[PDB]
Amino acid sequence: PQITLWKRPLVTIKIGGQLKEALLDTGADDTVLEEMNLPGRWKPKMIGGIGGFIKVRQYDQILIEICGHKAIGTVLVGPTPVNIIGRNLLTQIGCTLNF
């Protein structure tokens, strides 16, 4: 599909057995999801943006379905105000910028 940018590019994702709304974010190196209790091991991480840094938990090899397109990679979980799909997964679903 083609998504115009008049409004936030929010799409439905499926992760850890839950459906959620998330931003397709070309400005995000990594994928950052709102606090959720995923099972398995994780490693602490800090990611910075406008306003400073937040502490997140890094989970590896997590399956995510983005608008019906399957992907698997690293997912960060922490106190983000918005679910953010980063480039690590956008590449896997064939997402491109076009103008």
Place this chain on the structure above:
Amino acid sequence: PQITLWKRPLVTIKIGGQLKEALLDTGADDTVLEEMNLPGRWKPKMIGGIGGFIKVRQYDQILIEICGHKAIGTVLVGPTPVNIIGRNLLTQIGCTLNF
């Protein structure tokens, strides 16, 4: 152009007659540039990111050329970690997400 996302979508911009590098950021509503000098009046404003809120200088109706495409709109100047082009200008250059 069609831009894949295996690297950061960084592009050259021209603003105030000066060239800079900026990130095409579909997760940003607004355009936020690092500290710089711009002519004209500005208003103090607040913007929030993943880590909190920062004070910025809002410049309205600013000419800015992005990868050879012209836009005229609001530019926020403040302590952002990187120059980001937000949807307010991405729409003006006809940018869309595609997968």
